[PDB]
Subunit: 129 residues, 3 copies
């Protein structure tokens, strides 16, 4: 076998997507897998990724209620050697669309370069209050 | 949606908690979720976290027996902008209490700052020998 | 309890192993656990590790087909204080053997030092074309 060293700037990302809508369990990990594939295909990017099922604990921003849900940790290693701006923008757009598609108040996105965190973002719904 | 960049020094932690007591499967991931919520509430800290089910392999320290168990990886991203000392101390106290509550010989704690590991600790029972 | 700070250069690794052979679901996480234990024992290294079940999305290299499979993320924290070369070589050998044992086209290996990625490798089958 060949020991192919990955090129590029070593970008990766983690996205956390919950599966409750409010306090109601609603979605499944496979829903997130399929939606992520669909989004990334429309970006023209290699969709390859890992999806980890989790239990998540989250404090709702508006009410302060503490909720426990199933959630998904999406792990993306850039295998295409994208620029920082290209990779970051495509991951941010994916996170923003996942938030909409799953009716989420927040989606958390973490961008890394050689494992060093460049940015952690909370993508937050602007539902009118 | 709003792309809220997380503030603070970028602290996060990982805690590994096994669910065997010795070679006996005993606990579940939901037990760890509930206990973690309870501990963190008593700390006055936001409990929000992710919990990943795993299979773990561990060599017992006293006997050298190799055990395979279910285990839990707790992932904590600091969203409150705590100081290094505050966050580190609260994570260490959580790990220490989890070790007691689940009758564990070891709990592993990893503290990161912008993804760079600051400390890896094994919290080890002092059972008399 | 004792708060034992881990020594060494802080090496760790992640290995991603799929459970499809081509487009056919074939293996299970427990197969990977058992094979990893067996390999690491023959290396004379402490086998201790964590194994995370995942859903994985992968583009096949030769055909371009997009496949969704179950997969396993192996997380290895070096607790023995190995040298960089020793740890890296033993993780690479484990990844290479896992690729063979599970009839995989690719296995992904990531080596970290204090969380900073030193290398990401794709271990790729040289099946004759
Ligand atoms: N501080 C933190 N550290 C680690 N994981 C966290 C976290 N805050 C949230 N998470 C993870 O992020 C997931 C989604 S956050 C909450 C989503 C919710 N359903 C909504 O509508 O907004 C959680 O389930 C948890 O797995
Ligand atoms: N070197 C290593 N690298 C990665 N994960 C490890 C590890 N050593 C232990 N772990 C993880 O840490 C978990 C708990 S360690 C063993 C706990 C045991 N039940 C006790 O009573 O002490 C394991 O199940 C495994 O998931
Ligand atoms: N770019 C990427 N980012 C994150 N995870 C990835 C990835 N590419 C692959 N993976 C992970 O790596 C696993 C194995 S890669 C594909 C293995 C396949 N069965 C083969 O025979 O080659 C996938 O299931 C996925 O979990």
């Amino acid at each position: 076998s060949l020991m192919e060293r990955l090129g590029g700037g070593g970008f990766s990302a983690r996205i956390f997507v919950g599966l409750n809508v409010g306090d109601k369990p609603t979605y499944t990990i496979e829903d997130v897998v399929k939606d992520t594939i669909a989004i990334r295909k429309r970006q023209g990017i290699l969709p390859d990724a890992s999806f980890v099922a989790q239990r998540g604990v989250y404090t709702e921003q508006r009410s302060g209620q503490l909720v426990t849900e199933n959630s998904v940790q999406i792990i993306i290693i850039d295998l295409e050697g994208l620029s920082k701006e290209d990779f970051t923008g495509k991951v941010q757009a994916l996170g923003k669309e996942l938030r909409e598609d799953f009716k989420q108040e927040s989606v958390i996105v973490e961008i890394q370069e050689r494992g060093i965190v460049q940015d952690v973002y909370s993508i937050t719904a602007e539902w009118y209050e």
